Short mmCIF file of C-alpha atoms in Angstrom, two decimals:
data_model
loop_
_atom_site.label_atom_id
_atom_site.label_comp_id
_atom_site.label_asym_id
_atom_site.label_seq_id
_atom_site.Cartn_x
_atom_site.Cartn_y
_atom_site.Cartn_z
CA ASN A 1 -21.82 12.69 2.68
CA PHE A 2 -19.31 12.01 5.51
CA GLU A 3 -21.03 11.96 8.92
CA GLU A 4 -20.30 12.08 12.64
CA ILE A 5 -21.71 8.69 13.70
CA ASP A 6 -23.06 7.62 17.08
CA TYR A 7 -21.46 4.35 18.17
CA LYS A 8 -24.85 3.12 19.36
CA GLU A 9 -25.88 3.00 15.70
CA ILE A 10 -23.23 0.27 15.10
CA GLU A 11 -23.84 -3.48 15.45
CA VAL A 12 -20.51 -5.33 15.47
CA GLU A 13 -20.46 -8.76 13.73
CA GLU A 14 -17.13 -10.51 14.36
CA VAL A 15 -13.67 -9.49 15.54
CA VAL A 16 -12.11 -12.16 13.27
CA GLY A 17 -12.14 -11.59 9.52
CA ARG A 18 -10.24 -10.05 6.62
CA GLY A 19 -8.95 -6.91 8.38
CA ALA A 20 -6.25 -5.97 10.88
CA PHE A 21 -7.22 -8.00 13.94
CA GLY A 22 -7.71 -5.85 17.06
CA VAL A 23 -8.02 -2.65 15.00
CA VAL A 24 -10.60 -3.36 12.25
CA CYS A 25 -13.98 -5.10 12.77
CA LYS A 26 -16.77 -5.89 10.32
CA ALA A 27 -20.07 -4.41 11.49
CA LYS A 28 -23.37 -3.04 10.17
CA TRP A 29 -24.56 0.56 10.35
CA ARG A 30 -27.85 1.93 9.03
CA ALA A 31 -28.50 -0.95 6.60
CA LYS A 32 -25.01 -0.94 5.12
CA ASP A 33 -22.07 -3.28 5.77
CA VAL A 34 -19.11 -1.34 7.18
CA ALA A 35 -15.62 -1.77 8.60
CA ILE A 36 -14.93 -0.06 11.93
CA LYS A 37 -11.29 0.87 12.60
CA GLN A 38 -10.68 1.87 16.21
CA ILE A 39 -8.04 4.55 16.70
CA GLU A 40 -5.97 3.35 19.61
CA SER A 41 -3.35 5.56 21.30
CA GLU A 42 -3.75 9.22 22.18
CA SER A 43 -1.12 10.37 19.70
CA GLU A 44 -3.09 8.62 16.94
CA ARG A 45 -6.42 9.95 18.14
CA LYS A 46 -5.15 13.55 18.16
CA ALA A 47 -3.75 13.35 14.63
CA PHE A 48 -6.85 11.50 13.41
CA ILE A 49 -9.43 13.93 14.76
CA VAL A 50 -7.56 16.92 13.36
CA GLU A 51 -7.73 15.42 9.85
CA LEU A 52 -11.39 14.25 9.82
CA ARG A 53 -12.21 17.10 7.40
CA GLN A 54 -9.66 15.92 4.84
CA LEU A 55 -10.94 12.39 5.24
CA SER A 56 -14.51 13.60 4.62
CA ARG A 57 -13.28 15.08 1.35
CA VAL A 58 -11.65 11.84 0.06
CA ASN A 59 -13.31 10.51 -3.10
CA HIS A 60 -11.42 8.38 -5.60
CA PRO A 61 -11.88 5.15 -7.59
CA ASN A 62 -8.96 3.43 -5.83
CA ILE A 63 -10.10 4.16 -2.23
CA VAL A 64 -13.03 2.53 -0.46
CA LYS A 65 -15.83 4.85 0.61
CA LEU A 66 -15.51 6.44 4.05
CA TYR A 67 -18.96 6.71 5.64
CA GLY A 68 -18.01 8.71 8.71
CA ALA A 69 -16.29 8.77 12.05
CA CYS A 70 -17.18 8.30 15.68
CA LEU A 71 -15.72 10.46 18.40
CA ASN A 72 -16.50 8.23 21.39
CA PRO A 73 -14.90 5.73 20.95
CA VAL A 74 -12.69 7.36 18.27
CA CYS A 75 -13.06 5.27 15.13
CA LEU A 76 -13.39 5.43 11.37
CA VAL A 77 -16.38 3.84 9.66
CA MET A 78 -15.75 2.82 6.07
CA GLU A 79 -17.19 0.70 3.33
CA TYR A 80 -16.61 -3.02 3.75
CA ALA A 81 -15.94 -4.04 0.14
CA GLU A 82 -15.91 -7.61 -1.11
CA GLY A 83 -12.63 -8.88 -2.50
CA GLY A 84 -9.33 -10.27 -1.32
CA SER A 85 -6.50 -8.47 0.40
CA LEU A 86 -3.50 -8.12 -1.87
CA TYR A 87 -1.51 -9.78 0.92
CA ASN A 88 -3.56 -12.97 0.71
CA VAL A 89 -3.59 -12.92 -3.09
CA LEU A 90 0.21 -12.82 -3.01
CA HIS A 91 1.10 -14.96 -0.02
CA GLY A 92 -2.06 -16.75 1.13
CA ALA A 93 -3.05 -20.43 1.25
CA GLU A 94 -1.50 -22.68 -1.43
CA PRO A 95 -4.26 -22.61 -4.13
CA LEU A 96 -3.23 -19.12 -5.32
CA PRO A 97 -4.23 -17.18 -8.44
CA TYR A 98 -1.77 -16.91 -11.27
CA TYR A 99 -0.96 -13.34 -12.27
CA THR A 100 1.14 -11.58 -14.92
CA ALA A 101 3.59 -8.68 -14.99
CA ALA A 102 0.78 -6.61 -16.46
CA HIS A 103 -1.30 -7.29 -13.31
CA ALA A 104 1.65 -6.55 -11.05
CA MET A 105 2.32 -3.18 -12.72
CA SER A 106 -1.43 -2.37 -12.91
CA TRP A 107 -1.91 -2.96 -9.17
CA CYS A 108 1.07 -0.82 -8.27
CA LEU A 109 -0.06 1.94 -10.70
CA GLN A 110 -3.54 1.99 -9.19
CA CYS A 111 -2.02 2.19 -5.71
CA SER A 112 0.01 5.23 -6.77
CA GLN A 113 -3.03 6.85 -8.37
CA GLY A 114 -4.97 6.66 -5.10
CA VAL A 115 -2.05 7.86 -3.03
CA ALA A 116 -1.31 10.73 -5.41
CA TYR A 117 -4.90 11.81 -4.96
CA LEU A 118 -4.23 11.78 -1.20
CA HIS A 119 -1.00 13.77 -1.49
CA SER A 120 -2.39 16.35 -3.89
CA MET A 121 -5.45 17.25 -1.79
CA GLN A 122 -5.77 21.00 -1.13
CA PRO A 123 -4.98 22.90 1.09
CA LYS A 124 -3.25 20.13 3.14
CA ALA A 125 -2.08 16.79 1.81
CA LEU A 126 -3.40 13.60 3.37
CA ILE A 127 -0.50 11.19 4.12
CA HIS A 128 -1.52 7.53 4.13
CA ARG A 129 1.20 6.48 6.68
CA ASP A 130 0.81 2.68 6.50
CA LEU A 131 0.81 1.42 2.91
CA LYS A 132 1.12 -2.36 2.74
CA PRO A 133 -0.57 -5.25 0.94
CA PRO A 134 -2.78 -6.09 3.97
CA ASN A 135 -4.38 -2.64 3.49
CA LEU A 136 -5.05 -3.01 -0.24
CA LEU A 137 -8.00 -4.90 -1.65
CA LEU A 138 -8.40 -6.54 -5.07
CA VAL A 139 -11.90 -6.42 -6.58
CA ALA A 140 -13.50 -7.02 -9.99
CA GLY A 141 -11.90 -10.42 -10.58
CA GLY A 142 -8.57 -9.15 -9.25
CA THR A 143 -8.22 -6.31 -11.74
CA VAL A 144 -9.15 -3.22 -9.64
CA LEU A 145 -7.16 -2.30 -6.51
CA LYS A 146 -8.57 -0.18 -3.67
CA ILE A 147 -6.98 1.21 -0.51
CA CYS A 148 -9.13 -0.20 2.32
CA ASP A 149 -7.49 1.18 5.45
CA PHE A 150 -5.60 4.31 6.41
CA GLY A 151 -2.52 4.63 8.59
CA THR A 152 -2.35 6.55 11.85
CA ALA A 153 0.24 8.84 13.47
CA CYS A 154 2.11 6.56 15.89
CA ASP A 155 4.53 7.86 18.52
CA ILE A 156 8.21 6.93 18.39
CA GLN A 157 8.05 4.65 21.48
CA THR A 158 5.27 2.57 19.94
CA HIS A 159 7.15 1.31 16.86
CA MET A 160 9.17 -1.24 18.82
CA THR A 161 6.39 -1.88 21.34
CA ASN A 162 2.98 -2.55 19.67
CA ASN A 163 3.71 -4.55 16.48
CA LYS A 164 1.08 -3.21 14.06
CA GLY A 165 2.73 -5.46 11.45
CA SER A 166 4.08 -2.66 9.25
CA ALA A 167 7.81 -3.24 9.77
CA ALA A 168 8.65 -4.47 6.27
CA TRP A 169 7.16 -1.33 4.67
CA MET A 170 8.16 1.36 7.18
CA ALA A 171 10.45 4.18 6.09
CA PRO A 172 13.47 4.52 8.40
CA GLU A 173 12.62 8.15 9.25
CA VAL A 174 9.23 6.92 10.50
CA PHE A 175 10.97 4.35 12.72
CA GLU A 176 13.37 6.87 14.19
CA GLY A 177 11.28 10.06 14.37
CA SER A 178 7.75 9.36 13.17
CA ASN A 179 8.42 11.79 10.31
CA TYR A 180 5.35 10.71 8.36
CA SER A 181 5.59 12.54 5.02
CA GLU A 182 4.77 12.05 1.34
CA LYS A 183 8.13 10.33 1.04
CA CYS A 184 7.25 7.70 3.65
CA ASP A 185 4.32 6.51 1.49
CA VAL A 186 6.69 6.53 -1.47
CA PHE A 187 9.16 4.26 0.38
CA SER A 188 6.40 1.79 1.22
CA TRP A 189 5.35 1.88 -2.43
CA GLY A 190 8.81 0.88 -3.57
CA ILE A 191 8.81 -2.11 -1.25
CA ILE A 192 5.34 -3.16 -2.49
CA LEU A 193 6.57 -2.96 -6.11
CA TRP A 194 9.37 -5.38 -5.28
CA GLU A 195 6.85 -7.59 -3.44
CA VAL A 196 4.38 -7.97 -6.27
CA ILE A 197 7.07 -8.49 -8.89
CA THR A 198 8.84 -11.26 -6.93
CA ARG A 199 5.76 -12.59 -5.08
CA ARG A 200 8.04 -12.77 -2.00
CA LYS A 201 7.62 -11.41 1.52
CA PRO A 202 9.99 -8.46 2.09
CA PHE A 203 12.70 -8.96 4.74
CA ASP A 204 11.50 -12.54 5.42
CA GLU A 205 15.06 -13.75 6.12
CA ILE A 206 15.19 -11.60 9.30
CA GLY A 207 13.85 -13.52 12.28
CA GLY A 208 13.50 -12.13 15.78
CA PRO A 209 10.58 -9.84 16.58
CA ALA A 210 9.25 -7.30 14.08
CA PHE A 211 11.55 -4.48 15.23
CA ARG A 212 14.62 -6.32 13.92
CA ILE A 213 13.24 -5.55 10.46
CA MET A 214 12.99 -1.85 11.24
CA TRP A 215 16.58 -1.86 12.55
CA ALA A 216 17.70 -3.69 9.41
CA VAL A 217 16.19 -1.15 7.04
CA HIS A 218 17.29 1.74 9.28
CA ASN A 219 20.85 0.37 8.95
CA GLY A 220 20.29 0.41 5.17
CA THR A 221 19.20 -3.16 4.35
CA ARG A 222 16.97 -3.41 1.27
CA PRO A 223 15.34 -6.26 -0.64
CA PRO A 224 17.64 -7.97 -3.14
CA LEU A 225 17.83 -6.75 -6.70
CA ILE A 226 15.62 -8.60 -9.16
CA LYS A 227 17.17 -10.71 -11.91
CA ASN A 228 16.57 -9.20 -15.39
CA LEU A 229 14.20 -6.46 -14.19
CA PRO A 230 13.72 -3.70 -16.82
CA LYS A 231 16.11 -0.89 -15.94
CA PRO A 232 13.39 1.82 -15.99
CA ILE A 233 11.57 -0.25 -13.38
CA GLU A 234 14.68 -0.95 -11.30
CA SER A 235 15.52 2.76 -11.32
CA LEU A 236 12.05 3.72 -10.10
CA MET A 237 12.15 0.95 -7.47
CA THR A 238 15.52 1.76 -5.98
CA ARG A 239 14.99 5.52 -6.04
CA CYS A 240 11.88 4.84 -3.94
CA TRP A 241 13.96 2.96 -1.35
CA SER A 242 16.53 5.71 -0.75
CA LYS A 243 17.55 6.56 2.82
CA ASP A 244 17.33 10.26 1.89
CA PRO A 245 13.61 11.05 1.48
CA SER A 246 14.41 13.93 -0.93
CA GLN A 247 16.05 11.48 -3.36
CA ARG A 248 12.69 9.66 -3.66
CA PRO A 249 10.19 10.42 -6.43
CA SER A 250 6.84 12.02 -5.68
CA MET A 251 3.60 10.11 -6.05
CA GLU A 252 2.68 12.22 -9.09
CA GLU A 253 6.01 11.35 -10.70
CA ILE A 254 5.27 7.68 -9.98
CA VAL A 255 1.80 7.88 -11.53
CA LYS A 256 3.22 9.39 -14.72
CA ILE A 257 6.15 6.98 -15.02
CA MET A 258 3.94 3.95 -14.41
CA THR A 259 1.19 5.20 -16.73
CA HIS A 260 3.82 5.48 -19.44
CA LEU A 261 5.15 1.97 -18.78
CA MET A 262 1.69 0.39 -18.97
CA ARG A 263 2.02 0.57 -22.79
CA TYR A 264 4.48 -2.31 -22.39
CA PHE A 265 2.04 -4.29 -20.18
CA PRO A 266 -1.13 -5.11 -22.11
CA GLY A 267 -3.72 -7.45 -20.65
CA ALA A 268 -4.02 -6.06 -17.11
CA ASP A 269 -7.82 -6.18 -17.54
CA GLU A 270 -7.87 -9.99 -17.87
CA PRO A 271 -9.47 -11.33 -14.66
CA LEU A 272 -7.51 -13.72 -12.51
CA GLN A 273 -8.79 -17.15 -13.42
CA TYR A 274 -6.14 -19.78 -13.20
CA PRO A 275 -4.24 -21.34 -10.29
CA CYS A 276 -0.47 -21.38 -10.49
CA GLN A 277 2.34 -23.94 -10.11
CA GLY A 278 22.48 -12.77 -4.59
CA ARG A 279 19.76 -11.45 -6.87
CA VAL A 280 16.25 -12.93 -6.86
CA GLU A 281 14.20 -14.20 -9.73
CA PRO A 282 10.95 -12.40 -10.50
CA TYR A 283 7.67 -14.21 -10.25
CA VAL A 284 6.24 -12.32 -13.26
CA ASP A 285 7.66 -12.64 -16.81
CA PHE A 286 9.03 -9.59 -18.62
CA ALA A 287 9.60 -11.19 -22.07
CA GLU A 288 6.61 -9.42 -23.61
CA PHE A 289 7.87 -6.11 -22.17
CA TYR A 290 11.22 -6.52 -23.87
CA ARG A 291 9.60 -7.45 -27.20
CA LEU A 292 7.23 -4.45 -27.07
CA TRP A 293 10.01 -2.13 -26.00
CA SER A 294 12.13 -3.12 -29.01
CA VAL A 295 9.12 -2.67 -31.31
CA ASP A 296 9.15 0.93 -30.05
CA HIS A 297 12.92 1.50 -30.09
CA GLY A 298 14.89 -1.24 -31.92
CA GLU A 299 17.73 -3.22 -30.25
#
């Protein structure tokens, strides 16, 4: 039951916490713990209010619950779920969990399953618009991934002006024209796949303010190829990055390809438990994938 909430019913706890600072706050409403995401500019408010119905229909195991929305001030009220942002699991403070290729592929598959649900909704698709590890949450000992924030429709001017911190994942057609489409979420997904496999921050070698990243990828820069990555994976990855959005897979294609490939990645249900000690080397290890692949096909 998605509701139209009165802001008076909200008691805000702290502005500092796990979510996007200055957009997302942890608060309480009714008796429940919630996350309040304020919708900032007028362009974003217009696009957000129009799609409240679709949001009220969202229900999926890889998306946090959405309790409702407020219309003054415009904001989305969602479930505050316990866990760690995928960003901090990957790149956070130095005592970090160890994870395997199976986990990497399982997280990306789950991401695609939630986004495919979004894209397939009828009559009108819901486009996520801002897929990135800060907006994904790991729960159940790091084995289940959930989308915990939704993107907004930002005007062209704003990309170089109000760093929302999405530059490394932003499709070039979003930078130049704010052409949010299914293919923009697919581009972000391809970047995230590179990021979890290498455990590296995309476009980290580009200093300057955030917008230098968006100019780099708009000029065609991409993350480096990954040493010894399975060619089915590399093909999916680089097709996702394409400048031409039509040359990019759909989210349903991605779900099916990745579901297939999970047969070569057993053990994704093992909880995270241990700490851990040109082209780029992968963080994860594909040796088991190659062995299992040959068991299926020979050399």
